[PDB]
Amino acid sequence: GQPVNDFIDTATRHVLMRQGVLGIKVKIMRDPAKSRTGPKALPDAVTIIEPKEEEPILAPSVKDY
């Protein structure tokens, strides 16, 4: 998919030797968190903000200013 275009660089290189040639194929996948100028995460990613304990009750009452 699309994240491929966004996050992985590839290169093929032909390395000519005494016997024949070999194909080097390099693939690098870069930290998307660091994206900088694009999307900062995979389309996959789904973060939930973590609530907060509450200490409720305290029967009514009102503040004045």
Added chain:
Amino acid sequence: XXXXXXXXXXXXXXXXXXXXVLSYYKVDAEGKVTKLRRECSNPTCGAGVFLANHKDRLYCGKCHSVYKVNA
């Protein structure tokens, strides 16, 4: 593949012949020098270059061929 055939007769090349040449020019009894063979009135060939003597034919070789002066 197939290899070879030939109803024969291979073609050769050329030679530039021999000739200890430019004897042509003649100097009299000490020491006046007269040119044999006439030279070229083309601006390109400042009259050092001569004309070969055939028949009808006098011809400038320096002009790689160029021009047909006839006397």
Added chain:
RNA sequence: ACCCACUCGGCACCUUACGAGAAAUCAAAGUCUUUGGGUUCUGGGGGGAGUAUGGUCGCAAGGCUGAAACUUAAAGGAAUUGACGGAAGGGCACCACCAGGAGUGGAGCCUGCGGCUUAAUUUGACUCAACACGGGGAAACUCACCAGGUCCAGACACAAUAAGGAUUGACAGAUUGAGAGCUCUUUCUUGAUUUUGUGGGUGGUGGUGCAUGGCCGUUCUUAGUUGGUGGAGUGAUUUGUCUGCUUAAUUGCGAUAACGAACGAGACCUUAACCUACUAAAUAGUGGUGCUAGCAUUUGCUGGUUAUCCACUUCUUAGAGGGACUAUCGGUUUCAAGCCGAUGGAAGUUUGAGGCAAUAACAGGUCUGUGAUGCCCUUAGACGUUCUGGGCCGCACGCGCGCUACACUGACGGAGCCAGCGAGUCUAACCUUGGCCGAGAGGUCUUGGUAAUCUUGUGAAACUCCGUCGUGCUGGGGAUAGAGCAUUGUAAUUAUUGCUCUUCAACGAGGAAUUCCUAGUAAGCGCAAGUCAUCAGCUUGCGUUGAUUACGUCCCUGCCCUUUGUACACACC
């Protein structure tokens, strides 16, 4: 006779496993390096071989006893994971079938393949996954093939020749297809650039895709791959990754010695749909106004006018947003994931269609895309290259993709008259409107455009309407062939293509077979783009007209999955 409890001794099963084992497994195969209850028998790597020999028993066939030489690095056991089967159980799919549509298979031609022919008819590829494929529509070129002619563009090093010239070129004639000084005659020219030899290079559409890279196709219209902590196992391993249900999906639910995750699917991206909300526009358009034509006249109706001005953004353009999450409701389901129906909605089949796409495999195709490349071959009487000419088109015939037809839901003739995706000329001749001339093809003079500006509203074709014909190989059909005219091109003969007249074939719905397809789809219909000097019956996209039939299954076929067997693991070639 039957039931309950007990107990000796039987044939067995069940669950455990403290314990054993290399494991499979085992209440003995336990009580074994913490090694001793009694006793009997047999084995000491594989083959050679239960062979030779002697003894013995037998009527015999044979039985018992039973060697060595020599050969050899493994043979063997159990389990694991793969791979594979002409074993079994499940699934998925219009490259499967059901219900059907439109066909192909029959005909004419077009075009590839075989075959034959040939100087040559260059060549790759042969089930799906070779054959309108190599973007492969070849007149030269391309081009590799064939008949023949030039050239070196043979780096460099050493040696040799050699300034008394190493070498170079050529006018005319001869030659030659040729205005190739190819060679020859002849005799000027040139000046250390070459020549000759060896060494070494260099080019090659020469060989090897079974030496390679890269790319691509296929498996795959598939759903699979892995690691952390836990559990099992001495171990390779396994569980997680599973009976079921569910999904297009190892997509999920659920079950659960597993829990929680990552690659792949999904997400993501592109394009088609919806925004009287946002920002705008003489390279897009609308309303008002002026200038103005025509028809009515009573306002009116229908046009002209890239700026005569004013305002707008519904339509067009493209930025930014918004929108859908199978929403609401209800059926159904283990009331789970889901599935179904109704309403709403631009939109509810993964929204439609694509792009991307893991792990692994193949001796799939490509050395003929590459100045990617190993090795082999070849290298001046070239397999380098170029030039002239022919050839890839050759035709008893087999095969594939196609085009056009057999007519009356039609052909012909008037007339109506509507798309979308494209593309176009600088140091050049591309897209072409308009005016004339021409039956046509085309010609000619001008013209706008490097483009939302001009071609172009690309006035496309099927289609619609009024006529002619009237079922007759007919006015359906347009093969084959003759004559003439033009266009591209240096060149049109074997006829590039276009036009006119004439000639008027087979084909009366196509055997056995076989392809493709579920909605703006199928089928019909044209167009633009690729190729392109010229040539589309091909492709790639595009819009126009627009259905019948399923919404299911495992019968055929194909494939994945379990279970199972394996003496395979280079893995059933």
